[PDB]
Structure formats: C-alpha cells, structure tokens
Design a protein around this ligand. Structure first.
Ligand SMILES: O=C1CC[C@H](N2C(=O)c3ccccc3C2=O)C(=O)N1
Ligand SMILES: [Cl-]
Ligand SMILES: [Zn+2]
Length: 109
C-alpha cells in the first residue's frame, strides 16, 4: 500500500507519471530553472509520462538541457501546462521535464 507511487495532474487527476520513472539528468532528477519571462520552475525529470498532449514542433530556443529541443506538454485531459517534452539529444534521446508543484503524488490504483 505505498502512498507515493503515481503522479497525477493536480487540476483534474489525469494519470501522468510514476516515481519509478524519475530520471536523474546530470545527477539530479530535480532542476531549478527560469524562463525568459523570469518564472522559476522546479522541474522533475522523468523517463516516461502519459496522459499529456505535446503541442507544436520542437524548439531549441532557451533549452534548459543542452542538446535537447522542447515541446510544451499540457495535461491531455484539462490543458494545464505540466511541463515539456525534450527530444533530439543523446543518452537519453528523449525525456520529460514536468513542473513538480503542478502534479499530485499518491497511491497507485
Ligand atoms: O527548456 C525550456 C522550455 C521552454 C521554456 N520556455 C518557456 O517557459 C517560455 C515561455 C514563453 C516564451 C518562451 C519560453 C520558453 O523557452 C524555457 O525557457 N526553456
Ligand atoms: Cl508553478
Ligand atoms: Zn489536468
């Protein structure tokens, strides 16, 4: 009966990822970053996620992760901006950077 197994969208409950899929990029699964508008994000990196909708074509502009291009990842249910999908890089080729405070963590179902 673990209570820290599954990450859901904090706004609607859509299943998004799992603690087991946490990915330590550059030695840490947590990355604190700012965008050009100055917003600060505490981003958790995951190997896999589901329940998202990836919007548009990838861009390398302002990428927080060297060698990766990003696409916006919205909750596929409610449209809440949950983070980004990264692609085009090496080891791994792709991963997800999701905004920790926009997810709710809980037991598996
Ligand atoms: O890796 C990334 C993900 C995208 C993120 N980003 C944003 O959060 C944003 C908002 C508005 C205009 C442009 C951007 C942008 O590049 C950013 O700054 N770096
Ligand atoms: Cl936030
Ligand atoms: Zn949602």
């Amino acid at each position: 009966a673990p209570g820290a197994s599954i990450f859901r969208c904090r706004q609607c409950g859509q299943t998004i990822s799992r603690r087991d899929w946490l990915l330590p990029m550059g030695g840490d699964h947590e990355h604190v970053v700012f965008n050009p508008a100055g917003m600060i994000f505490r981003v958790w990196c995951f190997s896999l996620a589901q329940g998202l909708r990836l919007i548009g074509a990838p861009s390398g502009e302002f990428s927080w992760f060297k060698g990766y291009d990003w696409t916006i990842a919205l909750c596929g249910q409610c449209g809440s901006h949950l983070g980004w999908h990264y692609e085009g890089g090496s080891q791994p080729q792709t991963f997800f950077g999701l905004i920790k405070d926009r997810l709710a963590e809980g037991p598996a179902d």
